[PDB]
Design a protein around this ligand. Structure first.
Ligand SMILES: Nc1ncnc2c1ncn2[C@@H]1O[C@H](COP(=O)(O)OP(=O)(O)OP(=O)(O)O)[C@@H](O)[C@H]1O
Ligand SMILES: Nc1ncnc2c1ncn2[C@@H]1O[C@H](COP(=O)(O)OP(=O)(O)OP(=O)(O)O)[C@@H](O)[C@H]1O
Lengths: 634, 597, 293
DNA sequence: ATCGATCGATC
DNA sequence: GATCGATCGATAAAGTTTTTTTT
């Protein structure tokens, strides 16, 4: 009709005039920023969605798609005044919608859900590639007007006719080749992921048709959840069942996001914002120019566990990473740091690895028995009935920062461990079992959760007598964190009076008052809360690259030489050329957290005095004699 | 258009830079030897007019055929009939968006890429000049099909009561072009988050086909047009690349210019090659002098004698390493991959050892079998590289015995049984039984049961872990030089530019000096090795009286005669000498006493 | 070097023009991506979108550069210019042409090592004087490709010393001693050093309403602490009402007469001298009191 | 190549 | 308006040796 013309005026006012939380023009700021990157996307805030649905709940759940088409043309004028002539490049914008207060699984769909907004999860199975789609059907007659304008083709219906507005004959419609742009099209089919499902039963299938600027965001195998509309296509033809009065199912999408973790939130950590625009990046410099940050961050990293310090020094250093420094036409350099824990059965070693899975950006948790010798790395899945032997990788190609638990699965230890210790040595390993000779590139990180045969001091003798893992695979790591706990009172209460208080941690204002309740529940002693500390690791890793100097080097020369000399005559397990490579590597890991690109003098001896003590403190009864050498380093 | 054509016959006979007049002076030079082709070099074309470029770079297919007809007419003029049509080859270097622009604006636009071709197909035929007859009246026409929108550009008409489709395709006066359907794979380093790579499809013309073997980097320029095959929902299509010019790097069939060997002859006259390559091969390796000499003789090789009876001698060498970790047994192997002409890197697990040699499958057309894959069919002349010769316990041993020592496999599977040729050269690096305790016990237990794999290899190094408290600090001085500060990028440009050889010149170099000189050892030098060998077996049997068993047999003795043939390929002398041969045993005698310790 | 190269590459030394405005490393890649980004620049025919398709796009720059008049006030870009052609082979102007000659003069190759170093610059001088005729063409492009990496090379430590924050405002000048970073070897020849200062005089080309004094740098690559120290000139932001020439060469006669322990004027230009390491620290001590402006 | 359906022409 | 004749379009095809983990 015509009142929808005023609707565009009625919301450009209602959106752009004010953004919540003490103004600041939040939505008025993220428009120009995604204009700067030239990436064709927008967001809508849920609380704004809660306020922009009061007159629009009967224009969202009643009519979801043609409301959006008139919603699309106002966003041009919402930025045409801001960025002039932006329509001369790519001429197009379309919006995306954020989270929604529904929890629908795949099973719970009925007739009442159709032609409306839907939200569902699952996992991505077998997928196709990228094709172009015509998207503007310039129809063509033969003798009359052979240009009927660029049409608007639908989904799988093949919208055409025989004759209209030219004649009434059976002259068919053809094509020609002037100025028909193309969007792309990628039909991921979806399988229900076996998470929240009453088990012991089958998976269920759907289909998903993606759209133009949302191609190949997902990878095969990874868990996703999709927010879009529901649609129908009564094709009147199906050939698995008989032909019947039925109709198929097509879910078109408007947005897509990654796997989420710890699904217990109320207003955050479900939407991947990760968009450090104004209130963050202007703030995040003064948090970097303080003097005890590296003595503050690693203390405040894993808040639930009081323990010995040196593991939290190491495990924070692991996900901070180094640099894959390339070189000229010669051998490449490993840019990874691979810790290995060793713990008594009952200390907190299974939790720090569990907690770091959330605080990373991407992860995997292949643990224990059932880890296949091939299923970690890439494998070839055989063809379906008319296809070719294709390559479908598993764990390690997906995970860039993955977490395994190689403790002592001894029956399969002689199977898989010939396929993980060349992910480090001959890094970027791939294989050609009965297929194609290729080489995928996976700069993955490895942590571990080793476990001795019983107690921690199962012998006085060296670690070859302690662990069943032999020498050379063990030497592909950098450091050996080992724990100790015999008998204490005041150190025992320091855990005991600590852990008892952790169990004691069991509407617009009230939504934020619960959010203010979320502040004080983690700020008893106030150790620098995790509302934002994970929010800058993602550009602590993809924006800053460090370098070194030369005047601060040759102190380490006698360190490698004498300690290798001191441990060959006393041979427990050796050090090689790669330990010193790890020495400078974790040195520049700390300096990346100053956001600084340099290397000081304070960081080297810091990084020295976390490796030299953590090597010597597992030797023998004669660790006491080695500690008489120790303060010469300091 | 005709007007446009009038603007190209009047342009490719007087375009010149300052008095060289080049484009007539190569078109004549390409009509004598039969090639019928041009190289326009579009960035050099722009000197006429930006408009006539812009009628090309915005619209396709029409421009290529008009240009081709103009060139054919000029070629016809430079003669005074057997005159074929020509083909074009364009080339530029703007930048290569690797595989990211897919549908947005790059449909039917000029584009430049970079990939690695992996899979060739058999040839085919499409027509380009026809002669068509009707059924009813014996009409006769002729229709040429030059450029494409694949077929169905224009179909056979209805004109000559008269029944439709009255026309047929005779085969008496026709010409034909061949297509390829070779498949391009992405160069596997530049799409990095976590994803597997993808692939496209491409065809070409006869006078620029069969110019590629699988396993090379190539750059490629062409079109992004769209076909539609009806053997999936919405009326969709598929992408492919019509290609124009593979102006790639070298072949990596020995035709090249003369100045490439001029400096090579000016370098080979200097008798300092053998000592300078040991530095100049691996610029980031601390010494390792004995091993470094073995790699340059592996890459060159010996010869192949087909001596006047049935049998033959396996003229090549196959080294083998083993040693402790942290002692460069692995990171050295990526270094030999780039320097080789053909190199394959399957270094892990053996990868289902039956799939290493050859594989069959049901094929979707005609439901048939044939032979498709293998890790040894593509590695002829070059060198493979593998590792971990301990925990491949299943079938690695049964898959390399026939693959080595005769290089004549034959697949006994459901279809063919053919002896396809092979000239491969293997290389491996493994681990002993955790390294240290093996060299502090009875000195066997290296390969747990079999000596029969060790007798097929010949040259074996054994590194160890000393505690020299003097040179190690220089090694600790060495790694901090390369790792940061990057002064070796500036040190090996201020010591290399007059003395050392860069990494890419050897790839130019080795393919020439192998494929020219066929050498032979000195005939009076045969007294030397015969007098050498008779005490080595005596040095062997002096040890077996000590209740010691295991491995030396005669196959290594006919490997030393290939070793002395190796440096003769380096010096490119057709005869050998005695200063030649005594340095060769000097390399092997440092791996004769290894059996004692 | 625009008509030779890629309108892309302005990506580096448009931040020089933002160093001519206010910034060098912090916010520029966050800032620059609207004005010099009318597309995420297409690399399909880009070799002739800075050669040929710029018929429409640099004429849009002809209508951008009067609506970028107000956008940042950045009007050290409009210049009258001059050009030559050949008849064919693409145009070459004279602005970029002097840039190739400076860079090609650089590369193109006790106290006994200096003779083999003093004879290098005279030799590589000789492969530039011949480059002014059409009898040679195919090495003029060699300086073109050696232009747009050495500027990337000279920047690679300029961003380091600027974030090192080792520029000490003592009383009048600012002292910077480049002791040893990386890539120290390209500073034996003095002609790179004036360009390095020419970039370094522009990082301090903000307002600076007081203390308009140029700096003195220091570096070392070889034995016995050669230390080819030099001075600069202050620069006006195009508003000479007071033609400041130099104050240093007056004081350079003093310290070459007073200490007399390995001080040299053997290098040709008076703006560059040599100094020993244990004498460069009392060099400034006679300079911080002798006010000779 | 044959059969069925639809359209056009003639009565 | 109905019936008959002619022309055009649509309709028929087939499988069971290599290779993966697993017990
Ligand atoms: N230092 C500690 N601080 C707080 N809680 C702890 C500590 N040590 C153990 N716990 C608690 O003990 C519980 C038992 O898990 P625990 O971490 O002991 O498994 P684990 O012994 O590490 O397992 P595995 O040996 O298989 O890795 C955990 O839920 C954890 O909360
Ligand atoms: N002889 C050497 N000279 C120079 N660098 C060396 C040498 N040996 C090892 N390296 C260095 O070791 C670094 C890492 O090697 P890597 O970790 O792959 O060793 P590795 O594979 O454990 O050793 P090995 O191959 O014996 O198992 C490389 O950057 C390389 O420079």
């Amino acid at each position: 009709p015509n009142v929808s013309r005023t609707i565009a005026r009625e919301l450009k006012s209602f959106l752009l005039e004010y953004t919540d939380e003490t103004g600041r023009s939040v939505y008025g700021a993220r428009i120009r920023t995604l204009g700067e990157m030239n990436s064709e996307s927008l967001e809508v805030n849920y609380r704004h969605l809660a306020e922009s649905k009061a007159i629009l709940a009967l224009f969202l759940a009643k009519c979801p798609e043609e409301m959006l088409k008139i919603f699309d043309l106002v966003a041009m004028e919402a930025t045409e005044l801001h960025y002039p002539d932006y329509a001369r490049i790519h001429s197009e914008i379309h919006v995306r919608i954020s989270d929604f207060p529904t929890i629908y699984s795949l099973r719970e769909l009925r007739e009442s859900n159709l032609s409306s907004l839907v939200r569902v999860t699952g996992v991505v199975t077998r997928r196709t590639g990228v094709f172009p789609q015509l998207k503007y059907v310039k129809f063509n007659c033969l003798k009359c007007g052979s240009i009927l304008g660029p049409f608007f083709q639908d989904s799988n219906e093949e919208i055409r006719i025989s004759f209209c507005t030219n004649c009434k004959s059976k002259g068919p419609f053809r094509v020609n080749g002037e100025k028909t742009v193309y969007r792309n099209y990628q039909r991921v089919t979806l399988q229900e992921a076996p998470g929240t499902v009453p088990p012991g039963r089958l998976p269920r299938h759907r289909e998903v048709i993606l759209l133009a600027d949302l191609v190949d965001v997902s990878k095969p195998g990874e868990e996703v959840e999709v927010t879009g509309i529901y649609k129908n296509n009564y094709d009147g033809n199906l050939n698995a069942k008989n032909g019947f009065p039925v109709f198929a199912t097509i879910i078109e999408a408007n947005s897509i996001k990654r796997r989420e973790g710890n699904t217990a939130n109320e207003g955050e950590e479900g939407l991947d914002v990760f968009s450090w625009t104004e209130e963050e990046e202007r703030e995040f410099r003064k948090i970097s120019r303080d003097r005890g940050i590296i003595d503050k961050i690693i203390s405040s990293m894993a808040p639930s566990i009081y323990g010995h310090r040196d593991i939290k020094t190491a495990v924070a250093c692991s996900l901070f990473g180094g640099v894959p420094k390339n070189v000229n036409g010669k051998h490449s350099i490993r840019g990874d740091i691979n810790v290995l824990l060793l713990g008594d059965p009952g200390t907190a070693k299974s939790q720090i690895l569990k907690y770091v899975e959330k605080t990373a950006h991407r992860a995997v948790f292949a643990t224990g028995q059932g880890a296949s010798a091939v299923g970690l790395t890439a494998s070839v899945r055989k063809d379906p009935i008319t296809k070719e032997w294709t390559l479908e990788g598993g764990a390690l190609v997906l995970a860039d920062k993955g977490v395994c638990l190689i403790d002592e699965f001894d029956k399969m230890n002689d199977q898989d461990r010939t396929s993980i210790h060349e992910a480090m040595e001959q890094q970027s390993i791939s294989i050609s079992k009965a297929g194609i000779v290729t080489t995928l590139q996976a700069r993955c990180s490895i942590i571990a959760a080793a476990n001795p045969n019983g107690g921690r001091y199962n012998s006085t003798l060296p670690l070859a007598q302690n662990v069943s893992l032999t020498e050379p695979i063990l030497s592909r790591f950098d450091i050996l964190c080992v724990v100790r706990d015999l008998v204490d009172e005041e150190a025992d209460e320091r855990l005991a009076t600590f852990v008892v208080d952790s169990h004691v941690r069991s509407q617009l204002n009230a939504r934020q008052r619960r959010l203010q309740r979320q502040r004080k529940k983690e700020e008893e002693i106030s150790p620098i809360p995790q509302e934002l500390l994970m929010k800058y690791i993602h550009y602590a890793r993809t924006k800053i690259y460090p370098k070194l100097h030369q005047m601060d080097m040759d102190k380490v020369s006698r360190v490698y030489a004498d300690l290798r000399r001191e441990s060959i005559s006393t041979g427990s397990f050796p050090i090689t050329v790669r330990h010193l490579e790890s020495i400078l590597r974790i040195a520049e890991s700390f300096a990346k957290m100053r956001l600084s690109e340099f290397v000081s003098s304070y960081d080297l001896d810091r990084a020295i005095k976390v490796v030299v003590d953590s090597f010597v403190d597992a030797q023998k009864v004669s660790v006491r004699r080695q500690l008489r050498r120790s303060f010469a380093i300091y | 258009n005709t007007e446009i054509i009038k603007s190209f016959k009047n342009f490719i006979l007087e375009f010149r830079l300052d008095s060289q007049f080049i484009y007539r002076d190569q078109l004549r030079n390409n009509i004598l030897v039969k090639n019928y082709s041009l190289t326009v070099n579009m960035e050099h074309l722009i000197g006429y007019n930006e408009d006539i470029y812009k009628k090309l770079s915005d619209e396709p297919s029409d421009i290529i055929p008009l240009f081709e007809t103009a060139i054919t007419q000029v070629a016809k003029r430079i003669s005074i009939n057997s005159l074929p049509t020509f083909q074009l080859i364009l080339n530029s270097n703007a930048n290569q968006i690797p595989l990211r622009d897919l549908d947005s604006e790059h449909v039917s636009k000029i584009v430049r890429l970079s990939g690695i071709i992996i899979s060739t197909s058999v040839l085919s035929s499409r027509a380009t000049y026809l002669s068509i007859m009707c059924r009813n009246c014996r009409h006769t026409t002729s229709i040429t099909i030059n450029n494409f929108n694949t077929g169905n550009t224009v179909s056979l008409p209805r004109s000559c009561n008269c029944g439709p489709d009255p026309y047929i395709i005779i085969h008496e006066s026709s010409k034909f072009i061949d297509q390829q359907f070779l498949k391009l794979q992405e160069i596997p380093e530049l799409v990095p988050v976590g994803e597997m790579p993808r692939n496209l499809t491409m065809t070409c013309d006869r006078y620029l086909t069969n110019k590629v073997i699988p396993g090379t980097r190539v750059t490629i320029v062409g079109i992004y047009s769209i076909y539609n095959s009806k053997n999936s929902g919405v009326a969709i299509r598929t992408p492919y690349i019509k290609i124009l010019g593979i102006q790639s790097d070298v072949e990596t069939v020995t035709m090249f210019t003369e100045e490439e060997e001029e400096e090579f002859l000016q370098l080979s006259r200097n008798p300092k090659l053998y000592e300078i390559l040991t530095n100049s091969i691996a610029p980031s390796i601390f010494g390792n002098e004995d091993i470094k000499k073995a790699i340059v003789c592996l890459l060159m090789g010996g010869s192949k004698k087909i001596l006047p009876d049935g049998m033959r001698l396996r003229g090549d060498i196959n080294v083998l390493l083993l040693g402790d970790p942290g002692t460069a047994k692995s990171q050295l192997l990526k270094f030999v991959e780039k320097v080789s002409p053909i190199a394959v890197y399957t270094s892990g697990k053996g990868s289902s050892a039956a799939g290493l040699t050859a594989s069959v499958q049901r094929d979707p057309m005609t439901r048939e079998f044939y032979l498709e894959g293998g890790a040894m069919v593509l590695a002829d002349g070059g060198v493979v590289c593998i590792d971990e010769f301990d925990k491949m316990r299943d079938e690695d041993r049964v898959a390399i015995h026939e693959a080595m020592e005769q290089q004549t496999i034959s697949i006994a599977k459901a279809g063919i049984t053919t002896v396809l040729n092979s000239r491969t050269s293997v290389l491996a690096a493994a681990n002993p039984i955790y390294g240290r305790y093996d060299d502090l016990k009875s000195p066997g237990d290296n390969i747990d049961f079999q000596t029969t794999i060790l007798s097929r290899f010949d040259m074996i190094f054994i590194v160890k872990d000393d505690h020299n408290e003097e040179r190690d600090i220089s090694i600790a001085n060495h790694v901090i030089n390369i790792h940061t500060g990057n002064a070796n990028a500036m040190q090996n440009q201020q010591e290399e530019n007059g003395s050392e050889i860069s990494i890419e010149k050897m790839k130019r170099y080795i393919t020439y000096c192998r494929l020219k000189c066929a050498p032979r050892l000195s005939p009076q030098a045969a007294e030397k090795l015969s007098s050498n060998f008779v005490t080595i077996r005596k040095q062997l049997l002096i040890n077996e009286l000590e209740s010691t068993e295991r491995p030396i047999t005669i196959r290594q003795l006919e490997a030393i005669i290939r070793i002395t043939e190796s440096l003769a390929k380096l010096e490119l002398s057709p005869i050998a000498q005695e200063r030649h041969v005594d340095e060769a045993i000097r390399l092997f005698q440092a791996s004769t006493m290894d059996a004692a310790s | 070097l625009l008509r030779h190269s890629s309108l892309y590459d302005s990506f580096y030394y448009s931040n020089y023009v933002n160093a001519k405005l206010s910034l060098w490393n912090e916010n520029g890649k966050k800032r620059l991506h609207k004005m010099f980004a009318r597309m995420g620049i297409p690399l399909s025919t880009a070799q002739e979108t800075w050669l040929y398709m710029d018929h429409s796009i640099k004429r849009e720059l002809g209508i951008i550069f009067d609506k970028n008049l107000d956008r940042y006030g950045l009007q050290d870009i409009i210049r009258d210019g001059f050009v030559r052609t050949l008849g064919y082979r693409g145009s070459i102007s004279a602005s970029e042409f002097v840039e190739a000659l400076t860079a090609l003069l650089e590369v193109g190759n006790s106290a006994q090592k200096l003779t083999n170093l003093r004879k290098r610059w005279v030799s590589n001088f000789w492969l530039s004087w011949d480059a002014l005729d059409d009898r040679k063409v195919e090495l003029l492009n060699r300086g073109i490709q050696l232009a747009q990496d050495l500027q990337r090379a000279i920047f690679n430590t300029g961003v380091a010393i600027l974030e090192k924050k080792l520029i000490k405002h003592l009383r009048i000048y600012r002292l910077c001693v480049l002791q040893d970073g990386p890539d120290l070897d390209l500073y034996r020849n003095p002609l790179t050093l004036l360009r390095l200062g020419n970039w370094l005089i522009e990082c301090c080309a903000e307002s600076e309403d007081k203390q308009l004094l140029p700096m003195v740098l220091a570096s070392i690559d070889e034995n016995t602490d050669t230390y080819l120290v030099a001075g600069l000139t202050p620069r006006y932001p195009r508003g000479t009402k007071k033609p400041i020439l130099n104050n240093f060469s007056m004081a350079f006669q003093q310290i070459t007469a007073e200490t007399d322990a390995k001080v040299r004027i053997d290098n040709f230009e008076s703006s560059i001298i040599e100094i020993r390491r244990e004498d460069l620290s009392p060099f400034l001590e006679k300079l911080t009191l002798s006010g000779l402006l």
